[PDB]
Amino acid sequence: FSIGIGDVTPGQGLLKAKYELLNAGYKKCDEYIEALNTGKLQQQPGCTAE
Amino acid sequence: MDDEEETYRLWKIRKTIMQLCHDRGYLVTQDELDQTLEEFKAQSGDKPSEGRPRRTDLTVLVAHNDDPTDQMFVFFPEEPKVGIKTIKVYCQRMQEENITRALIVVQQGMTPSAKQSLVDMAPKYILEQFLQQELLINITEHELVPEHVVMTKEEVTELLARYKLRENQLPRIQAGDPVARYFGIKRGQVVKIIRPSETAGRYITYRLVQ
Amino acid sequence: MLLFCPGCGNGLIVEEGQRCHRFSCNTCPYVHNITRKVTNRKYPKLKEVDDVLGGAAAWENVDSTAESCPKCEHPRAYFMQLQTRSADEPMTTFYKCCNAQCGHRWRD
Amino acid sequence: GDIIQFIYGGDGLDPAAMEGKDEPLEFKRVLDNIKAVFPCPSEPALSKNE
Amino acid sequence: KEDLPKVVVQGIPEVSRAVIHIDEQSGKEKYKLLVEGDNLRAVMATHGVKGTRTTSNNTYEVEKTLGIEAARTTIINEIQYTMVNHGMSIDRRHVMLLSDLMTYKGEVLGITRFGLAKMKESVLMLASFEKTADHLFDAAYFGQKDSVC
Ligand SMILES: [Zn+2]
Ligand SMILES: [Zn+2]
Numbered sequence: 001f002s003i004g005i006g007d008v009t010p011g012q013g014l015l016k017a018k019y020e021l022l023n024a025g026y027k028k029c030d031e032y033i034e035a036l037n038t039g040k041l042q043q044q045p046g047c048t049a050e
Numbered sequence: 051m052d053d054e055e056e057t058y059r060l061w062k063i064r065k066t067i068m069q070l071c072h073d074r075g076y077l078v079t080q081d082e083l084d085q086t087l088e089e090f091k092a093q094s095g096d097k098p099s100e101g102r103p104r105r106t107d108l109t110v111l112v113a114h115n116d117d118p119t120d121q122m123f124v125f126f127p128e129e130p131k132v133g134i135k136t137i138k139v140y141c142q143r144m145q146e147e148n149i150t151r152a153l154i155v156v157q158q159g160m161t162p163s164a165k166q167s168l169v170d171m172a173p174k175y176i177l178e179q180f181l182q183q184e185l186l187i188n189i190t191e192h193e194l195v196p197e198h199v200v201m202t203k204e205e206v207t208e209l210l211a212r213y214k215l216r217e218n219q220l221p222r223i224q225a226g227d228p229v230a231r232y233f234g235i236k237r238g239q240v241v242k243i244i245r246p247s248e249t250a251g252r253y254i255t256y257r258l259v260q
Numbered sequence: 261m262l263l264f265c266p267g268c269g270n271g272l273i274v275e276e277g278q279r280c281h282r283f284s285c286n287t288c289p290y291v292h293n294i295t296r297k298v299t300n301r302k303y304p305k306l307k308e309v310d311d312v313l314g315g316a317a318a319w320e321n322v323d324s325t326a327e328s329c330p331k332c333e334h335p336r337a338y339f340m341q342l343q344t345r346s347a348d349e350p351m352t353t354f355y356k357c358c359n360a361q362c363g364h365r366w367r368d
Numbered sequence: 369g370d371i372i373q374f375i376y377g378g379d380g381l382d383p384a385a386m387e388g389k390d391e392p393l394e395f396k397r398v399l400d401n402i403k404a405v406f407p408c409p410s411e412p413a414l415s416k417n418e
Numbered sequence: 419k420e421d422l423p424k425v426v427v428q429g430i431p432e433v434s435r436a437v438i439h440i441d442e443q444s445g446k447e448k449y450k451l452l453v454e455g456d457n458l459r460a461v462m463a464t465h466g467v468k469g470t471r472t473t474s475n476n477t478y479e480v481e482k483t484l485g486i487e488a489a490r491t492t493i494i495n496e497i498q499y500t501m502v503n504h505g506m507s508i509d510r511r512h513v514m515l516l517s518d519l520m521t522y523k524g525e526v527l528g529i530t531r532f533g534l535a536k537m538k539e540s541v542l543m544l545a546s547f548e549k550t551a552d553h554l555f556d557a558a559y560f561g562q563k564d565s566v567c
Pocket of ligand 1: 265266267268269270271285287288289290
């Protein structure tokens with residue numbers, strides 16, 4: 001029983017699997033900024049919009 | 051709208067006082083205990099604010115069930131703030147016929163000199179006080195208040211002979227406790243406490259009052 | 261407000277005169293006749309209406325996962341991560357919340 | 369010499385020597401444990417009423 | 419002019435902030451009123467909230483309002499509520515014995531330097547807790563007998 005550097009390695013289909021998720025996350029994150037700027041994000045719980 | 055809430059608050063404390071006089075051991079009929087609002091309005095009217103349902107009529111006489119020739123007086127002061135002579139004339143109005151135990155249900159804050167004068171003398175006449183605001187809910191069955199029962203000395207001696215201990219060994223409880231002031235127990239008395247549980251059953255505990 | 265005297269430079273306080281009140285001061289002789297109307301209007305900060313906190317509406321904000329809970333066999337559940345120092349070495353624990361008709365909270 | 373509690377816990381059981389989350393012992397586990405360690409084929413079965 | 423806002427018009431000066439919590443179930447909805455104050459005697463004696471079903475966090479105030487026997491139960495629930503928030507597990511009688519240790523003699527006594535002097539009556543064990551010579555000289559002044567037990 002042993003471990004090497006080959007066990008922990010990025011997969012071929014794994015590099016583009018998380019790339020699209022990170023891109024969608026950033027595309028959803030850079031919109032809430034302008035939403036807060038112009039005025040959006042109707043908050044249900046009592047708190048600050050920030 | 052305020053008078054309706056006042057009538058409800060006074061009916062609530064009347065019901066708590068009746069429940070207390072009932073589970074204390076006095077003879078209280080059930081019809082007066084679980085009195086409806088429609089039945090309560092038939093004996094005392096709602097309007098005006100301080101007219102027909104005056105504190106002069108709010109004065110009931112409780113009958114002890116064990117001893118026939120034993121009755122307790124209980125009433126409410128007319129003015130909100132308690133005085134010195136207003137309670138003197140009342141305890142002398144209570145002292146005159148056949149009564150030695152009286153209860154005053156105080157409406158607003160109290161007077162320290164009045165408390166001192168009441169606690170000085172206690173040969174046979176004893177005056178106990180109860181705030182109106184605190185007497186708005188039953189404290190015996192609230193959420194987690196274990197059932198308490200006043201015992202007798204013939205069982206106190208048997209309990210002492212059971213575990214072979216003294217009265218000092220028995221854990222003592224305060225006399226200014228809401229439950230202790232509710233049941234009205236003096237020094238040198240044991241209370242039985244029933245503690246229920248949802249896993250095994252209910253346990254029995256014994257306590258002393260100081 | 262804040263009003264000062266032009267002669268000396270100190271402040272004035274309203275006092276009573278012979279027939280009517282007057283603006284006077286105790287530093288130099290100076291009296292101002294009170295006229296038709298002087299008034300100051302203030303706007304204290306008003307209070308708003310409080311919001312109802314708690315409920316599933318706020319719970320939809322945090323995102324859940326798909327893992328069964330052994331209480332009522334329900335796959336829907338919320339998972340959170342937390343850092344805790346154990347006795348031997350660092351250990352990352354998960355808080356589990358059941359989103360169902362029972363609604364339990366576990367920490368494994 | 370003052371007594372604290374009349375019975376430790378309510379029943380006088382050591383929390384260390386216990387079997388299941390507060391319990392003295394599990395009875396179904398002991399049941400199907402003794403069910404297999406003592407097989408008695410010759411002895412017949414009986415109903416609930418007896 | 420600066421105390422007109424300070425003058426309270428309604429409510430209890432003790433309670434500061436209140437919010438309502440929504441509980442959901444199979445088909446039923448419930449509304450629970452949690453407030454942040456200390457005087458429970460005033461909030462529980464209200465027309466709105468049911469005085470029967472109400473739980474508090476202050477042990478001293480709940481033993482002042484409900485009683486000393488009702489304070490030994492709320493002090494066990496708070497401890498168990500803190501142990502299940504950490505992913506740990508303790509036995510029920512382990513904390514039941516600790517709750518009965520500060521409930522048998524008088525009121526809810528705390529485990530401090532002053533409460534330990536009310537619980538135990540040995541000057542030698544307090545000699546390490548206290549300071550230079552105060553208790554040591556007051557013992558010789560008064561002249562009490564220490565029991566070696
Ligand atoms: Zn000037
Ligand atoms: Zn569940």
